[PDB]
Symmetry: C3
Subunit: 88 residues, 3 copies
């Protein structure tokens, strides 16, 4: 792989998170936020900027959604913790 | 700072959800939370690893407590357990 | 605690389940196991990285060959592949 191929995949993941927030697809936000954080922890650099954008959207979903279950809340906040520690 | 404290606070809530999950048979949730707690604990250390040790003990029991756990679920849980056990 | 042989054992069984999930079209399992393998391989190196390499080749094959993979499954699988491929090069 190249870094450019990785950031393209991370960008497409970010776009799906943007739409998943409107859709209420909480599970995919949890899964993609965890996957993006696993990638950015190995890549650093621009991968962390994309993770920062994904983290912002997940935070908003966590605050604005009235559909999120208690199980999804605890998973999403744990994934947020991984991201927040990386983007700090 | 406020980051690490919120992190370990979030991890403690997840610990409680893993316990309920282990009793409802929500093995998927146990797998997901154990992997998320390990991803966080790897970056934080300290009290995060104490919390991970406890979640590992909870997940280890569920392994062979009620044969509701499928073969696919078992291999995923064992792989997640391995991640956590190495960090411990 | 755990031993490297116990971890390598679990990693080999995961790879067996991945290859089976590839031919059964179980996309979700491949995504979950590929990510779990990369998480473990990051901490152990050695033969863990060789098992990850095999799992990565199988997941690439699944991405190119399968037909009932959803759009959302695809973007998860590509990102998990990115994680694995970066670790293999680290
Ligand atoms: Ca919806
Ligand atoms: Ca992970």
């Amino acid at each position: 792989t190249t870094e450019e191929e990785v950031v393209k995949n991370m960008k497409e993941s970010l776009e799906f998170i943007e739409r998943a927030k409107e859709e209420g697809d909480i599970e995919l936000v949890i899964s993609l936020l965890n996957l993006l954080a696993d990638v950015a922890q190995l890549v650093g650099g621009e991968a962390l900027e994309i993770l920062k954008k994904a983290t912002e959207l997940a935070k908003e979903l966590l605050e604005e959604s009235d559909e999120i279950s208690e199980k999804e809340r605890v998973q999403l906040k744990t994934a947020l913790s991984q991201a927040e520690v990386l983007i700090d």
